[PDB]
């Protein structure tokens, strides 16, 4: 069936021991394809200690026979505005964040990394001229960072669109424009990672909260996915033990409809900090079994 | 009335212009006491750019007539395990995290900073020997960091207990132990900031999920609070337009019962990222109006 994976966001703060985490993904989840989260080792940490730990993960995962296909921004990263921030200095700290995340990913010998693109201030979000001026700087920064990433040995970067009018890209049309702006201008490809819970967010996208609309405008650029359960009313990141609009069969039918091959459906499931480790692990296991029960 | 303040977590990613943020707290929320969040300027950022931005917020708030009483950890910070992490290198990254936060706080001329103490890994959380080993290192770290803070001009550090058995301090008994261990050993005081949603978390604390139990074991050490609305079943951080067990009047009755004076009740309200700016702002204003509506004895 569908190529399933897991983003390690479920394990944040909890199963930190590299061999224990690899074993959990292999033996408990029965999954092979992994996306490593910045929420395990912060790009900003001094590089010696950061990379020592990130490399320990990379080694443990290789040894368990798992494939870390990419690293990706998480909640610590998403807290700040990065490339669409309201000052050049803050946008340059976005450059430096991603530059450092690229270094860490190269230390892991992982081929790709990505993140949401960034976020406008409240004032800037309301001002199209301001948005475009900021964006032009951001777009040039990603050209330079693609070149850097290529020199570090990476093969691809990703941008993850978001369900916010105050950020970019939000809509399938926004993502199409970003992808056109970068295509033929970057030394390695910059592609889209589309999160099902973002695309299906109804309050912002209404009748365009629809994955066919994403394929219509963006199919050729979508290189990977985040999957999660949601009611379409907030970005839930629920597991597949929970009810909502993203049934496992809906996922498998999309997979088959578009003849997908290597565009990993990474489960990106978030738990409240205060949930107990045993309950999170049980839930994650039942959730993966629910996903694997879809009929191809 | 009770001493209300606001933690700037509600503004993260949104009202970032320093004078607009300051004016919003002053004019729209009608408040004076502020807790600045690490979520606006990351302690890890390079010092020069980091302090330029942090200092711009400090100056704008001071000019608007607001008092930034402390800086405090937010979600970016809480993502990591820090002082209770399973390797000494990860613990040392927690040390450096707070050291850098102290640098940023001194640059702002803010007198105090704090955060939750840190977090055990899943394996270590179940090994009392490991917990003890890790904690003894953590405690020694905070001693050194209190010495550094004093040298940088700070007056106080805070630890925020949390509603997880995998972290310490969690219970009022944990918090009393940490406080007792550190009292007389630190060059400036290390005190508790208690979040009403953490103390009132029922699934962990059962009948000890209430604030009188916190005063019974910890009163002398609780120097500030986070207030939020909650149903007591998860750590909600709801605003005071929402139903739940932490009513404005209950907060005012607690404030009067214990003769509190300067121990600021900072509203710490969390909004989904995807909520619209104007909806967050409207709700925050109605929430602060609800809090001000409480009736003092
Ligand atoms: Cl572990
Ligand atoms: Cl703004
Ligand atoms: Cl440092
Ligand atoms: Fe996602
Ligand atoms: Fe809190
Ligand atoms: Mn999301
Ligand atoms: Mn909390």
Q: How far is the CA of B136 from the centre of ligand 6 (A)?
A: 38
What is the rounded (10 degree) CA torsion for A264, A265, A271, A277? -60
C-alpha span between A262 and A4 (Å, rounded): 10
Cis (ω within 30 of 0) for the bond into A284? Answer: no
Tell me the chain A residues in contact with residue B44 when contact means C-beta distances shorter than 8 Å.
Answer: 42, 44-45
Instruction: Indicate which of A43, A51, A122 best probes the interface with B, i.e. most B CBs within 10 Å of its own CB.
Output: A122
- Say which residues have a Cβ less than 8 Å from residue B113's Cβ, sequence separation at least 6: B70, B71, B72, B98, B101, B102, B105, B149, B154, B157, B158
Nearest by CB to residue A164, choosing from B44, B96, B273, is B273
Kindly list the distances between the CA atom of residue A9 and the CA atoms of A15, A94, A99, B241, B297, in Å, as whole numbers in the listed order.
Answer: 11, 21, 21, 31, 47
Burial of A270 (0-12, 13-18, 19+ CB in 10 A): middle
With CB atoms and an 8 Å threshold, state whether A49 touches B234.
Answer: no
With CB atoms and an 8 Å threshold, state whether A79 touches B81.
Answer: no
Three-class secondary structure of residue B296 per DSSP: coil
C-alpha span between A5 and A25 (Å, rounded): 10
Does A27 count as an annotated binding residue?
A: no
Ligand nearest to the CA of B225: 5
Ligand nearest to the CA of B35: 5
For the stretch B222-233, what's the b/e string if a residue is b when 16 or more beta carbons lie within 10 angstroms of its beta carbon? Answer: bbbbbbbbbebe
With CB atoms and an 8 Å threshold, state whether B76 touches A74.
Answer: no
Burial of A292 (0-12, 13-18, 19+ CB in 10 A): middle
DSSP string over chain A: ---EEEEGGGGTTTS-SHHHHHHIIIIII---EEEEETTTS-TTS-HHHHHHHHHHHHHHHHHTT-EEEEEE--HHHHTS-BTT-SSHHHHHHHHHHHHHHHHHHHHTT-SEEEE--BB--HHHHT-HHHHHHHHHHHHHHHHHHHHHHHHHT--EEEE---S-TTBSS-SHHHHHHHHHHHTTTSSS-EEEEEEHHHHT-HHHHGGG-SHHHHHHHHGGGEEEEEE-B--SSS---B-TTS-SS--HHHHHHHHHHTT-SS--EEE-----TTS-HHHHHHHHHHHHHHHHT---
C-alpha span between A271 and A283 (Å, rounded): 10
Does A268 count as an annotated binding residue?
A: yes
Q: Are B239 and B197 in contact (CB under 8 A)?
A: no
Q: Where are the beta strands (DSSP E) in chain B?
A: 4-7, 33-37, 67-72, 112-115, 156-159, 190-195, 222-227, 265-267
Tell me the nearest-neighbour CA distance from B235 into chain A, angstroms.
7
Ligand nearest to the CA of B104: 3
Tell me the chain A residues in contact with residue B53 when contact means C-beta distances shorter than 8 Å.
Answer: 87, 89-90
CA A36 to chain centre: 9
Tell me the nearest-neighbour CA distance from B212 into chain A, angstroms.
22
Q: Are A290 and A240 in contact (CB under 8 A)?
A: yes
Tell me the chain A residues in contact with residue B49 when contact means C-beta distances shorter than 8 Å.
Answer: 89-90, 92-93
Domain with B269 in it: 1-297
C-alpha span between A116 and A169 (Å, rounded): 8
For residue A82, the domain's CATH number is 3.20.20.150
How many domains does the structure of chain B reveal? 1
Ligand 2 ion: Cβ-proximal residues, 5 Å cutoff: A 121-123; B 15-17, 20
Nearest by CB to residue A42, choosing from B20, B80, B125, is B80
Listed as own residue / partner, the contacts of B206-209 with beta carbons closer than 8 Å and 24 or more positions apart are B208/B171, B208/B172
Q: Are B158 and B109 in contact (CB under 8 A)?
A: no
Ligand 4 ion: Cβ-proximal residues, 5 Å cutoff: A 195, 226, 268
C-alpha span between B69 and B264 (Å, rounded): 9
C-alpha span between A283 and A270 (Å, rounded): 11
What experiment produced this structure? X-ray
Tell me the nearest-neighbour CA distance from A291 into chain B, angstroms.
25
Does A213 count as an annotated binding residue?
A: no
Q: How far is the CA of A294 from the centre of ligand 7 (A)?
A: 37
Q: Are A10 and A273 in contact (CB under 8 A)?
A: no
Q: Are B139 and B182 in contact (CB under 8 A)?
A: yes
Instruction: Indicate which of B48, B75, B76, B279 best probes the interface with A, i.e. most A CBs within 10 Å of its own CB.
Output: B76
DSSP 8-state symbol, B261: S
Does B132 count as an annotated binding residue?
A: no
Does B160 count as an annotated binding residue?
A: yes
Instruction: Indicate which of B60, B121, B168 best probes the interface with A, i.e. most A CBs within 10 Å of its own CB.
Output: B121
């Amino acid at each position: 069936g569908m190529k399933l994976g897991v983003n390690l966001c479920f394990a944040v703060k909890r199963w930190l021991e590299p061999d224990r985490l690899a074993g959990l993904v292999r033996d408990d989840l029965g999954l092979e394809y992994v996306q490593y989260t910045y929420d395990l080792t912060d790009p900003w940490w001094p590089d010696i200690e950061r990379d020592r730990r990130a490399i320990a993960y990379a080694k443990a995962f290789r040894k368990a026979g798992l494939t870390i296909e990419s690293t990706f921004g998480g909640l610590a990263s998403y807290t700040y505005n990065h490339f669409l921030a309201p000052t050049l200095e803050l946008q340059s700290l976005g450059y430096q964040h991603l530059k450092r995340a690229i270094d860490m990913t190269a230390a892991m010998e992982v081929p790709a990394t990505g993140m949401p693109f960034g976020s406008y201030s409240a004032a800037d979000a309301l001002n199209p001229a301001r948005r475009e001026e900021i964006y032009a700087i951001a777009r040039d920064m990603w050209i330079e960072l693609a070149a850097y990433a290529k020199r570090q040995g990476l093969s691809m970067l990703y941008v993850e669109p978001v369900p916010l009018a105050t950020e970019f890209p939000s809509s399938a049309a926004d993502a199409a424009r970003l992808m056109a702006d970068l295509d033929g201008r970057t030394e390695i490809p910059v592609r889209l990672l589309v999160d099902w819970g973002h695309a299906l967010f109804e309050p912002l996208f209404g009748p365009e909260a629809d994955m066919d609309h994403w394929m219509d405008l963006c199919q050729p650029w979508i290189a990977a996915y985040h999957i999660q359960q949601t009611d379409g009313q907030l970005d839930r990141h629920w597991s597949f033990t929970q009810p909502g609009v993203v049934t496992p069969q809906r996922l498998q039918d999309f997979w088959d409809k578009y003849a997908l091959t290597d565009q990993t459906f990474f489960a990106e499931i978030l738990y409240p900090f205060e949930a107990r480790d045993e309950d999170v692990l049980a839930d994650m296991i039942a959730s993966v079994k629910a996903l694997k029960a879809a009929s191809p």
